[PDB]
Design a binder for this molecule. Structure first.
Ligand SMILES: Nc1nc2c(ncn2[C@@H]2O[C@H](COP(=O)(O)OP(=O)(O)O)[C@@H](O)[C@H]2O)c(=O)[nH]1
Ligand SMILES: [Mg+2]
Length: 185
């Protein structure tokens, strides 16, 4: 698991980690968090912090799931309050919902890319719901998000399915390694 490997890495470093999970509503974030944490971070374990923010903790690991876009407005106050202190950011996209790609691109650049606060923080993009027949490729989503324009951040886009498990732990190992090296630095 990524959950178990992250816990052991940060316990060996003798410190604490925070992982942010941002992305539009119905993208798959709560589903991925429940699955990757083998149940530990279920809906009946979420300390609710805001109208769209949920928070999880288990010893030295903390996860911050935030449903972005929609009616919710990005305020720099809310970012300091909820996401500031994160060591990695996970942007989740529903590849079978191309109608909302316009919105996911605008929120990714609003909250993460053109965010002075997010620095060398590894940003992992999950092109989720690949099992659906309408799912666009990971490269289609990368072009939709103008990732080809992201010149100053350390990112990675990996296609995955939260229902089948496909590529999930593999994408998360890239982030786990990127967090492990930069932690305490
Ligand atoms: N078929 C399929 N459905 C998914 C997948 N990921 C999430 N879903 C469904 O889409 C909904 C969105 O998940 P959830 O994490 O609760 O929404 P969010 O927290 O707003 O992203 C859930 O009810 C899941 O049943 C996937 O990979 N495949
Ligand atoms: Mg949710």
């Amino acid at each position: 698991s990524f959950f178990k490997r992250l816990k052991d890495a940060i316990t060996k470093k003798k410190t604490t980690v925070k992982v942010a999970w941002v992305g539009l509503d119905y993208a798959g974030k709560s589903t991925i968090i429940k699955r990757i944490t083998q149940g530990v971070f279920s809906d009946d374990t979420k300390r609710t912090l805001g109208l769209n923010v949920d928070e999880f903790t288990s010893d030295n690991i903390k996860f911050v799931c935030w449903d972005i876009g929609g009616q919710q407005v990005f305020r720099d106050s809310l970012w300091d309050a909820y996401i500031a202190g994160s060591s990695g950011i996970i942007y989740v996209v529903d590849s079978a919902a191309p109608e909302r790609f316009e919105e996911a691109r605008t929120e990714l650049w609003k909250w993460v890319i053109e965010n002075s606060k997010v620095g060398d923080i590894p940003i992992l993009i999950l092109a989720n719901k690949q099992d659906l027949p309408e799912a666009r490729s990971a490269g289609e989503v990368a072009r939709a998000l103008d990732l080809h324009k992201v010149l100053k951040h350390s990112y990675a886009i990996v296609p995955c399915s939260a229902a089948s498990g496909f590529n999930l732990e593999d994408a998360l190992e890239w982030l786990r390694q990127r967090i492990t090296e930069m932690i305490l630095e």
